[PDB]
Symmetry: D4
Subunit: 179 residues, 8 copies
């Protein structure tokens, strides 16, 4: 095994790791080789899980963490009961309170570049966009950050905790220069 | 076993299935033969469970999911402590906040026909009526939908998810044309 | 064993029964003989448990359900940190929100007689008094019922459910004419 | 073993004891000899745990209960995402709602002496200070007690319960005259 | 509810009760009315469970405790892999060590009458027969009791414990004169 | 609380302690006062539990650890299915393999004095007698020690471990000179 | 989803299904399309699990159910501590008692054809071969069936139970004519 | 953290890791620095755990995995009930069947050098000695290996699995050249 893989298994809880292994394998990647992609999907999975935990009881429908067909089924059921436009690509969450899907991005570049690139890929204007980064900076559409400051600051802290742990194990540099 | 039965056991959590088996057998039906009635009572059971989960901590007394005699006991205790009129037929919930019983219907026809038919069977005007359907449409008495928009839209989504899963297994058509 | 005892073990959850057995034995009574006292302390224990569950997260300190010495220790710690007067007899709860102890009574007589008798035994005016009965009637000091209408009506319903179950087993009559 | 140690193991839940054993051993002390320091760190650990439980869902980041390096990592991540000043010594909590770290002290002297001594050791003015004592008295910076009266009064009661239990076992006197 | 029913729920573990409720309802009986049949199937279910527990690790295939169709499926699979004759009626166990099915009877008459009646109903000579009674007497085909003396004497004791508990609750007499 | 009581709660697992509290209270004693009797019944309870664990799967019926009436019920069922003589006093176990009841004694005197005294109290010759002591010495009827040397030596070790723990807490001397 | 897939999820316990999903995806297959291969690997996984359960406590090292690299690691450790020849292909078990690896095959053809084909693929003579089929027939190298008759007959029964369940759902025919 | 530490946490189950952390800290070492000593005590802990699992039900008293004082207490109780000589240093197990203590060594040198060195340190001839190594070789006193070949070969395999995992992570070389 790799050094990064062992770090992934000791920093992220097992359920998040199992979902990341299932997600990458459903797209042909192997967690034991593309190990920094392994850490990325784990990090992205934890961020969305904390994000939907930031609301009430059932404000959010979690799209991420399901296989492509079941995730599109919930997308279909959401679209064809609320009336919203079906997105071109799979989002990560659906905000019932705000009646909009959310795409959540976790980047190691500037929140400006990453938002611009995914806002380009999305093109469909309806779905909300919300980016975090491993430095503590965040950016959202219309500056509408959906959650309150306390929930989002928990996410920024967890991200900086991961970058710190990667650096003390000498794996942050390759993780940075691999996105 | 039937194909529908296997779908029922893999789509609804085991506790809901056990309650549905107990409910149908207490009325002489067998889940392994009347399999689309098996899916209906499971669907109806999940909807009411989500419905009472939509309130505070103890807003709702769940009438559905108990055997006829224990369910009438709670109905008696509710009626003879609050003062409300004892219903002619067994409701599904009791709203303490609103001081009224609720009958919850899940239909594959128009919410208008199904409401009209059960409002006819109820006749007793006190108990509230609330219908959902597998298309995302809902209808309630006095347009009083009891729950907020977020909780009810979760129920509509789950219903459309079930219809989608039934269709990909070729069982939605017989399920539709069997109510 | 007795018929009432078997009913007590099948109607009240095991933790409440274990506490009732411990409470009665600490005062020389045996649950297997004084069986209707066994049902009374179980009923009284469940009512107080639902009562403190009716508040926020930690509004209530539960006095009932502890042995005499540990219960007086919490009473001491409560009195000697808030400043309230130490009661002559052991209460059942302590309301931090209202800064007062509560004595909870469950009776099979008129709420008026039972309140009057315990208000006589208490004499110390500080601690709040709140009575329920197996008919759905309640009475509290200064008409201050502490909890909201939804929480108290849950307690009245549970009480009428117990009386109904006792009656169908022919044990309500002796339970009534034994208090 | 010591008498105090046995009391520590029977009064504090095992998870708090395990954390206290880990905390003291990471600083060269042995719980089986410095047994009243063993009770102190257990008491301090429970107080902070109740303290962060006094907020919403994720108002507080718990600093206490982690080893020195992981605790400083969260401190780093907190500081370098919110922007606050990194404290000279390890605090116990971080209040996101109030955007400030908290140092929690549990003393057997006057809240005035203990606050003054730690306010002297801290010197860095940013982090909040909050002291409790085994008599029910508390003191906080700017008289800003962070939590509501109900949560803090739970902590004062638990403290007086511990002192009472220590006294009936003859160990309060040495515990007092050892801080 | 009945007095016997409450005794059934407090003497037999819940899994055995659930199986008995499922078994009787699959044959049109209601546990709440035919309550002594309810105790009989519970007693019969526990005896067979102890019986198969009396062997090695996987000496016995349990036929009892499954619904009619799944029980016949295992009967089919057993018959059509070992080669034994398929029985006319559903047995309770299958002994691999001895290569024979077992029918287990629990009676309140003489082991001689009960064996004779079921040996008459079976007619198919292959399947083994083994009877216990609430007095401690047992009888098996060819005097081949399958299990050792220690396992069978546990079953006789449990049976006499049940009869004793029924008698102190005044329900043994009707239970006896109802088979 | 007492020092011995705290030692009892930290040395014996909670289930054994709960049984000891129930056993002593059923005979009018209070664990918080007669604390060395509290340790004795706990020690006696653990020894019998290890003893019956020393056999096969179901060699032993545990008589100890039940209340007087349920323990006599099993005694009745054992006697009136095996045919053995019903003992004058309650034994602790029943050996099916050897077809005899066992009385287990744990003493702090010489195994000779303790055996002689209980062999005097028993008088009924049928039931087996087996004594252990906190020094590692054991004595059984006809020198028939029922279990193998490995199981009995585990019991002697556990006993000497308890005496050692009591001595380091200064409570062995009063425990010795109290039997 | 497919009808076979739903049957796979309701007939095999979830841990076996998760392993089968992981095993097939590690070789590029998707359980939701190659659904009868999905049932085959599940069936093969359960058979090997029952097989190693047929021995003592730790007679067998399970090779099947691990990913290719971890399975080869145990193969390496086994070979390079016992001294046996490292097999050309991955076996399913390692028998320590017999000091040989085992390849377990579950077929829907004649045990003769399936054994011959895999004995051809293995070529390395050391590793043992053991075939079962859905009719109850088995064949092993040197007629050495490793396990006793009771354990192997459990496996044959489970296999015939699966074929029966597949047939009543109309999926046995395609499952047969797909190997 | 270190790379080795992350490997230790992902290869050994958490209970073994917690014991190793407690064992090293009780002797002044820190698992996060002396990380290959961290892997050694974990490996040594797992080997002894498998070793005592290799016997009957209670053949072995586990000495390793307790703190120095509690481990010496069991040593005292063992010595002063069986009569064996108290060892100069703490052993790892006590074999009741063979009436002797066992010292278990796991080495990365030749089993001959390691045995000779510890046989020199022990000097007390009574206690048995048993060495394993990461190559699959073992050596015991009088060639008495206590366990059967199947149990010991499981231990040799697990050891070679650990060395393989260390090598693929580049940490075996420093682990070898550090003993
Ligand atoms: C700690 C808590 C766990 C929870 C995550 C989340 C996990 C699963 C649901 C469970 N699974 C597994 C597959 C089928 C299925 O249903 N997933 C993944 C897809 C969306 C979803 O719900 N869970 C479980 C309980 C409710 C819930 O939200 N949370 C929330 C805080 C952070 C975190 O980890
Ligand atoms: C997930 C959670 C489960 C809960 C459903 C509900 C289940 C039972 C109570 C348990 N049972 C079984 C029979 C006796 C009994 O008491 N039933 C059925 C009758 C009414 C009722 O409460 N539960 C259990 C915990 C509290 C509760 O509401 N929920 C709520 C969200 C959706 C869902 O499934
Ligand atoms: C369902 C839930 C249980 C809870 C009751 C209550 C139980 C105990 C605490 C546990 N015990 C046992 C003795 C030592 C101890 O600590 N008791 C008794 C004295 C006061 C108290 O807390 N519990 C447990 C979890 C938190 C809590 O309140 N509730 C609340 C709803 C109705 C009900 O039953
Ligand atoms: C009762 C409940 C428990 C909770 C305390 C707290 C415990 C741990 C998290 C668990 N551990 C152990 C080490 C790694 C780890 O994650 N710790 C310690 C450091 C901060 C933290 O969270 N827990 C667990 C569940 C969530 C939580 O807050 N509470 C809250 C009320 C009083 C109390 O005891
Ligand atoms: C205590 C232990 C339980 C065990 C009984 C038995 C229970 C079930 C299997 C579980 N269920 C439920 C339905 C689907 C299913 O699989 N049933 C019933 C049909 C045959 C069978 O196995 N169990 C469970 C573990 C293994 C086992 O034998 N025992 C054995 C001693 C007395 C007793 O109660
Ligand atoms: C560890 C294991 C536990 C077991 C002790 C014993 C406990 C109870 C049965 C549980 N209870 C509680 C009251 C009603 C009831 O049934 N009691 C007490 C009376 C006789 C008896 O069985 N248990 C539980 C599992 C099976 C068993 O023997 N053991 C055995 C080793 C030492 C020990 O503690
Ligand atoms: C019922 C019992 C379960 C057991 C199967 C087996 C399961 C796992 C071990 C658990 N996992 C999961 C991955 C990492 C890991 O360790 N696997 C798979 C590879 C080999 C192995 O052991 N288990 C678990 C307990 C011990 C054991 O053998 N059995 C045995 C009877 C039939 C059955 O299902
Ligand atoms: C898997 C199984 C676990 C078992 C190891 C062992 C663990 C503990 C006992 C638990 N603890 C923790 C401290 C106080 C205490 O009692 N320890 C450590 C000292 C000796 C001992 O028993 N356990 C637990 C159950 C019985 C047992 O032997 N095994 C055995 C196979 C490999 C393995 O890990
Ligand atoms: C699992 O791997 C995948 C998966 C897909 C399809 C489903 N994925 C999303 O819907 C998706 N994917 C990404 C992403 C994209 C490229 C590299 C890494 C990631 C990242 F962050 F996961 F780590 N970010 C999101 O935020 C996001 O919602 C495509 C490609 N790779
Ligand atoms: C379990 O089967 C039954 C049960 C009964 C008596 C108790 N039932 C209700 O009280 C009830 N029954 C129905 C319903 C009615 C006919 C077919 C299907 C259903 C449906 F939806 F369950 F699937 N809808 C409700 O909403 C509802 O509250 C009558 C008949 N069948
Ligand atoms: C357990 O039995 C006891 C206990 C005590 C001392 C502690 N008890 C209370 O503090 C107490 N006792 C009663 C009560 C009094 C008489 C009969 C029955 C009850 C009742 F309801 F429990 F069922 N009601 C309360 O509300 C109440 O707080 C005295 C006498 N009996
Ligand atoms: C575990 O033992 C230790 C630990 C440290 C470093 C980490 N500790 C804190 O950060 C800390 N330490 C104390 C404290 C100080 C001296 C004696 C006792 C305590 C007390 F209360 F724990 F019991 N109080 C706090 O409030 C507090 O946050 C220093 C010294 N001893
Ligand atoms: C559940 O109720 C039923 C079930 C059936 C069909 C399946 N049953 C058996 O296969 C069966 N049935 C009986 C039995 C027969 C009559 C009354 C009571 C019982 C008894 F003991 F359960 F309590 N004894 C056995 O030993 C036995 O194997 C027939 C009738 N009633
Ligand atoms: C719980 O307290 C009791 C209980 C009883 C009746 C039931 N007890 C037994 O059947 C019994 N009682 C004793 C024993 C006797 C006197 C003092 C202490 C014990 C001892 F060891 F428990 F600690 N030893 C046995 O071995 C034994 O089987 C009588 C008296 N006290
Ligand atoms: C935890 O660390 C320690 C502990 C002690 C005292 C208690 N220890 C034993 O009783 C002991 N110690 C060793 C050992 C010795 C030196 C280095 C590494 C180990 C090894 F293998 F743990 F990894 N081997 C055994 O087999 C053994 O029974 C001394 C020194 N270090
Ligand atoms: Mn996504
Ligand atoms: Mn995303
Ligand atoms: Mn209904
Ligand atoms: Mn309805
Ligand atoms: Mn009270
Ligand atoms: Mn009261
Ligand atoms: Mn601190
Ligand atoms: Mn502090
Ligand atoms: Mn049967
Ligand atoms: Mn039968
Ligand atoms: Mn006794
Ligand atoms: Mn005894
Ligand atoms: Mn194979
Ligand atoms: Mn050692
Ligand atoms: Mn060693």
């Amino acid at each position: 095994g790799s050094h990064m893989e062992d770090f992934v298994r000791q920093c992220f809880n097992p359920m998040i790791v199992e979902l990341a292994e299932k997600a990458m394998k459903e797209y042909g990647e192997d967690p034991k080789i593309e190990t920094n992609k392994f850490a990325a999907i784990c990090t992205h999975l934890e961020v969305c899980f904390m994000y939907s935990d930031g609301g009430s009881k059932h404000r959010f429908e979690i799209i991420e963490g399901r296989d492509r067909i079941m995730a599109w089924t919930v997308v279909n059921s959401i679209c064809n009961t609320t009336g919203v436009e079906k997105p071109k690509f799979l989002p990560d969450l659906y905000d019932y309170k705000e009646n909009r899907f959310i795409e959540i991005g976790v980047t190691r570049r500037e929140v400006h570049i990453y938002y611009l690139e995914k806002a380009n890929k999305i093109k469909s204007e309806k779905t909300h966009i919300h980016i975090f980064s491993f430095t503590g900076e965040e950016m959202a559409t219309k500056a509408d950050y959906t959650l309150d400051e306390e929930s989002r600051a928990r996410i920024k802290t967890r991200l900086f905790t991961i970058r710190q742990e990667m650096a003390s194990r000498s794996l942050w540099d390759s993780f940075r220069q691999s996105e």
